[PDB]
Amino acid sequence: QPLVGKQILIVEDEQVFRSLLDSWFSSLGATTVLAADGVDALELLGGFTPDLMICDIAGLKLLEHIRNRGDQTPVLVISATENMADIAKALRLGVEDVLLKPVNRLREMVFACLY
């Protein structure tokens, strides 16, 4: 129960991986909010602030819009992308890390971000 009291927003289009992340974070004690759609998640963020957001940048629009409004919400990107320029854009916007999928290292990044 290392993550009790932490709220995680998971933005993931793929139902299986969405459920996997929910199961993993929830098993650690976090309360999860999941959005299948990145545009839906942007709307959600206009009403609440999680301790960490996970998203795939294959997603940068969501990130650029929250960073331009002044939001300091921690973001971890999990993507299979091999596009260095895209990773670079995410890194410039401010992300905790960019994890390759299909995923481990996730535990490391999450804990090394939350506290």
Side-chain angles (χ1 to χ4, degrees), residues 57-71:
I57 55 169
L60 294 168
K61 298 298 184 183
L62 171 58
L63 185 60
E64 65 183 17
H65 286 297
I66 72 178
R67 294 286 186 250
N68 289 167
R69 66 190 282 205
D71 288 8

Side-chain angles (χ1 to χ4, degrees), residues 34-102:
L34 297 100
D37 185 81
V39 175
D40 285 358
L42 183 60
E43 192 183 14
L44 296 177
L45 285 168
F48 91 122
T49 318
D51 297 293
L52 172 66
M53 179 179 74
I54 298 201
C55 72
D56 190 339
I57 55 169
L60 294 168
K61 298 298 184 183
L62 171 58
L63 185 60
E64 65 183 17
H65 286 297
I66 72 178
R67 294 286 186 250
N68 289 167
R69 66 190 282 205
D71 288 8
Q72 309 292 323
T73 308
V75 174
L76 180 64
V77 173
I78 303 183
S79 187
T81 190
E82 293 185 350
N83 189 309
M84 301 301 86
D86 287 354
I87 293 174
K89 299 190 179 183
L91 293 171
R92 292 202 189 91
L93 287 165
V95 299
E96 306 289 302
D97 213 342
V98 186
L99 180 63
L100 188 64
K101 63 164 64 175

